[PDB]
Each structure stands twice: as C-alpha cells, then as structure tokens.
Amino acid sequence: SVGLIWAQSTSGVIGRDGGIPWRLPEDLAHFKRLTMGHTVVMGRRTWDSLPAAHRPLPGRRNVVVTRQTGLVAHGAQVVGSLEQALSPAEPDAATWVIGGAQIYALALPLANRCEVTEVDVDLPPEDEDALAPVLDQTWAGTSGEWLVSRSGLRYRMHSYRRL
Numbered sequence: 534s535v536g537l538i539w540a541q542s543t544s545g546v547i548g549r550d551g552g553i554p555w556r557l558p559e560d561l562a563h564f565k566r567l568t569m570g571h572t573v574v575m576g577r578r579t580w581d582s583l584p585a586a587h588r589p590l591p592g593r594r595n596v597v598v599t600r601q602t603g604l605v606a607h608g609a610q611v612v613g614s615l616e617q618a619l620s621p622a623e624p625d626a627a628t629w630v631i632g633g634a635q636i637y638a639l640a641l642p643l644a645n646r647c648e649v650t651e652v653d654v655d656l657p658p659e660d661e662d663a664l665a666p667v668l669d670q671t672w673a674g675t676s677g678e679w680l681v682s683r684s685g686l687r688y689r690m691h692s693y694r695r696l
C-alpha cells in the first residue's frame with residue numbers, strides 16, 4: 534500500500550520559496566498520526582526543506598529519493614528511484630509519500646490512497662510555486678467537515694482511494 538499525503542491551499546499551492554507558505558498545527562498533528570511508525574518517502578528538496586529539529590522525522594523510517602551519491606544532512610536512507618524507495622515494504626501498513634511535487638508526480642501512478650489537507654488560506658499561485666497533483670477519474674474521495682484551527686484558518690481533510 535502506497536499513500537500520498539499532502540497539505541494544500543484551496544488554490545492548490547503546496548510549496549513556495551523552499552517551504553510551506555502557511556502554518557497549521559492541526560495539520561502537523563494529523564500528518565504525525567497518519568505516518569508515525571511507518572516509512573516516509575520524500576524528494577531530496579523536501580528533505581533539505583525540513584527544519585533541523587524535524588530532520589529526520591522522528592519515529593519514522595526516512596527514505597530520500599535523489600540522483601546524488603548521498604547527502605550532507607544526516608538521518609536519511611538514500612535511494613535513486615521511487616521503485617527502490619518502495620520495495621521492500623512494511624507489512625500491513627502504508628508507505629507514505631510525503632512530497633514534494635516532483636516525488637508526488639512519480640508516485641501518483643503507483644498510489645492506492647491520497648490523504649489531503651485543504652487549507653482555506655488565500656494564496657494566488659506564483660510563478661515558482663509547487664502545486665498539488667491533480668487527481669483523475671481513477672480516484673474516489675470523501676471529505677470531512679470544515680474545521681477551524683486555533684490560529685483561525687479553516688481547513689478540512691479529503692481522503693481518496695483508487696477505484
């Protein structure tokens with residue numbers, strides 16, 4: 534089982550200036566609950582984007598997809614392709630692909646699940662933004678209710694499964 538998990542603005546932005554252009558504690562907790570104890574696979578730019586306190590993601594096996602021989606920043610297992618990242622795999626549990634846009638594009642054809650947090654923050658897409666992948670007719674989804682964060686932003690979760 535391969536799942537993609539991401540947070541996006543309503544406009545579809547996932548990344549800007551090497552980071553995430555909002556702060557949503559409730560999404561961080563959701564992401565931690567879904568991924569704890571599992572393998573997380575990410576692109577190398579996302580690895581380098583993590584705040585140092587959070588790299589590697591504690592309690593998870595951190596796999597980083599790169600074309601380089603290895604990385605200066607410690608704590609990852611490097612692989613040269615998504616296929617190498619995914620096999621061997623943890624039994625009875627998802628491997629989670631946690632970004633960014635390039636790695637989501639590689640993983641989308643292989644995935645069985647997508648877990649999306651939508652953040653109602655007004656962020657018109659800018660030229661260099663990383664955007665969320667678009668889901669085609671092979672996906673069926675359900676959506677939770679709109680929630681209000683302690684910081685005032687409205688957000689909600691969408692969950693998709695391959696038909």
Ligand SMILES: NC(=O)c1ccc[n+]([C@@H]2O[C@H](COP(=O)([O-])OP(=O)(O)OC[C@H]3O[C@@H](n4cnc5c(N)ncnc54)[C@H](OP(=O)(O)O)[C@@H]3O)[C@@H](O)[C@H]2O)c1
Pocket residue numbers: 538539540541546547548549550551552553575576577578579580582598599600601613614615631632633634635636637639663
């Ligand atoms: N909102 C969210 O949920 C979320 C989640 C994660 C990240 N983000 C944001 O997304 C942005 C980063 O995304 P991104 O698309 O620029 O980068 P990315 O997917 O994180 O990483 C791209 C890197 O992955 C490696 N790579 C890509 N294709 C490969 C392939 N076929 N084989 C081997 N290695 C390959 C390359 O590493 P090398 O250059 O080392 O070869 C490439 O530079 C940041 O803004 C980050 O904050 C947002």
Ligand SMILES: CCc1nc(N)nc(N)c1OCCCNc1ccccc1N1CCC(C(=O)O)CC1
Pocket residue numbers: 538539540553560561564565579582583584587590591630631632649650
């Ligand atoms: C939460 C962002 C997010 N949200 C959904 N829904 N999906 C994703 N793929 C995703 O990006 C994860 C990679 C970037 N994380 C990240 C980026 C910037 C600051 C902090 C973090 N971290 C959050 C998770 C914390 C942990 O889990 O311990 C540690 C700090």
